[PDB]
Amino acid sequence: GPAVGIDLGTTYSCVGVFQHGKVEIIANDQGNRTTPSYVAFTDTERLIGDAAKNQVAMNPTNTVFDAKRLIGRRFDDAVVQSDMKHWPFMVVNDAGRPKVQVEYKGETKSFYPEEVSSMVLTKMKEIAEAYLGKTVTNAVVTVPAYFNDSQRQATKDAGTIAGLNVLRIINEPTAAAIAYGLDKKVGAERNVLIFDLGGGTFDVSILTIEDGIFEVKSTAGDTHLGGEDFDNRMVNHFIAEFKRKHKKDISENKRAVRRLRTACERAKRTLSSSTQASIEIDSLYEGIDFYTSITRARFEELNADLFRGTLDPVEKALRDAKLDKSQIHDIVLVGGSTRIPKIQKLLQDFFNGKELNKSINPDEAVAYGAAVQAAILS
Amino acid sequence: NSPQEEVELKKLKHLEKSVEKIADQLEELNKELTGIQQGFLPKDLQAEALCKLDRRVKATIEQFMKILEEIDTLILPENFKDSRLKRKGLVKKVQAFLAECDTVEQNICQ
Ligand SMILES: Nc1nccc2ccccc12
Known part of the structure; x- marks a missing residue:
């Protein structure tokens, strides 16, 4: 078969194939376009991906x-x-x-x-072979721009052990830039900022694209900041709300908290397309039905400091790359969390009204560029 | 009695069907829990035999939880009374089975 592009993410991995003049993001056996980077070990079997994550509450100590x-x-x-x-x-x-x-x-x-x-890579190879109906060996694997020689060689060895002919190890911000064809764009050198908020981490990168050649000018961001932090602030809001409404503390009922968390995770996603989100959780804690709502405005207030705090690494990247915010040619959005309209607004307001690159699914943008590179290298 | 309500009631019928399938596994575990307690196995061997059922009881707990998470996605307006009654009774059934699941956990790996 052909060469594929793999985004080997921290929480979720993604695989793409360039075909019929367009990148196709390959769905897994459970029908998902992203596969959890999870490996579970049991008394009888080794599970990888969704199968491994589905039993994480059953076998936590043996699920990696x-x-x-x-x-x-x-x-x-x-x-x-x-x-x-x-x-x-x-x-x-x-x-x-x-x-x-x-x-x-x-x-x-x-x-x-x-x-x-x-x-995890053997799984992504299999996922691609299950769709294409052909054998897959050639692959482009992405790594973050801050990964060292050892971290890159470890990822290269992970592809070798998985039975892949790793065509190239490329930077995630470079892949996201390739996805938007910022390297085909005519003219002088292009200074590109990559805003990566997703997969439990945050990374702001500044690139230089001159006649197809990429240069990493600076890397900034919080390693432990993501969607899970925006969920917590909604969960805390609701636990405090249930306390005011019913004078009960649900915080020690693990199952009730999980039920609220799952509903919060979905309500967050809804607030990207809708202005209001509605939650109905029957017999949440001590037979009490939890019927509530959360506006986009409220969600934004609960996460106000966190959302704003995404501009600090944007400023730190510019300082380190010796560039003004006006000198940035392109802004690219990557990672599920960039879908939040407030995150997009604050970043666009900072860049004095400049239009962001957001058309390609933020979860799939890195795999998209990796799939273009895999087809280019072939 | 709106047609749009039949869409929601059908979802609840599929969820109820799936609950019966998990309830069957819980009943088999109960037959094995009682099976060891009133069985031929020696005292020391019984403790191991009981604890070997731990993976399945946690599997049954997880499945009931995933069912609840799915029921929790449904937005049933006030007019849809028959759907809110089916959703209340199913949540209460799953939670009574989860209490039975916890009882099995109390009797194993002690
Ligand atoms: N809205 C939103 N925010 C963060 C992460 C997401 C992932 C997938 C869909 C929507 C999301």
């Missing part, structure tokens, strides 16, 4: 994720030790290198971060 936060890193890395606090699975030292420790088929087994990412 966030391997991208560990890939090509040392065990004593500041990033490694600080993220270990939040993982239900074990991260162990193996002569300076981190390994993930799990119980698999009754025995204690350890795996390197790239061995886990290779299981």
Whole structure:
């Protein structure tokens, strides 16, 4: 078959194929255009993707994720030790290198971060072969622009273990820029800002595109800021609301909190197309039916500091790239969270009314560009 | 009795159908829980036999939770009374099964 483009994301991975003069984003066995970067180990089987995530509440200690936060890193890395606090699975030292420790088929087994990412890449290869009805070997794999030599080689090895002929390792902001054909655009050098808010992380990059050649001028952003923070502020709002309305604290009923969280996650998404969102959760806590609403205006107020805080790395990137905000030729939006109208408004207001590149699905933009590069390299 | 209500009532019939399928698994686990308690297995072996049912009880809990999350997506207006009654009774049934699921958890891996 042909060459494919893979976005190997922290939480969700995405695969694309360029065909009939357009990039097609390949859906998985469960019909999803993004596959969770999850690997579960059980008494009888090893699960990858959606199957692995569907049983995460059943087998937390043996379901691995966030391997991208560990890939090509040392065990004593500041990033490694600080993220270990939040993982239900074990991260162990193996002569300076981190390994993930799990119980698999009754025995204690350890795996390197790239061995886990290779299981995730084998899945994306399979996903592409299941759609195309052809064998897939050639692939373009994306990595963030701040990834070092070790982090890049680890990702390259994850493709090698997965049985892929990695045509190129390219930067995620470069891929997003290729998706909008900012490198085909005529004229002098183009200074492009990439605003990546999605996949549990935030990354602002400044590129230079001169006659097809890309140059990374600066990288900024919060590593642990995403959609989950915007959900929390809605969950807190509702727990406080249920307290005022019924004088009950639902915060200790795990199932009730999960029911509110799932409804909040959906209500957030609705507020990108609608101005109002409605929630109806029967017998939420102690037989009390929770019938409520949340306006776009309210959601924006609850996340006001967080949304504004996305401009700090935009300013820090400009300072480091030695450029004025007026000197930016293009702004690209990537990651599910850029869908929020307030995030788009604040960034457009900052850039004195400049139109953002937002037509291509923000979740799929990096895979789109990777799929173009895979077809270019072939 | 609006036609648009039949769309919502059909969704609830499919959700109710799926609940019966999970309720059948809970009943089989109950037959195995009672099966070990009043069985031929030795005292020490029983503790292991009971705890081996832990993956399935958590699987049954998760499925009932995913059903609730789906019922929680439905927006049933005040006029749709028959749909709000079906949604209340199904949520109450799933929550009574979840209490039975918790009872099984209390009797295993102790
Ligand atoms: N509206 C919105 N905000 C954040 C993430 C999203 C992901 C998918 C659809 C909509 C989303």
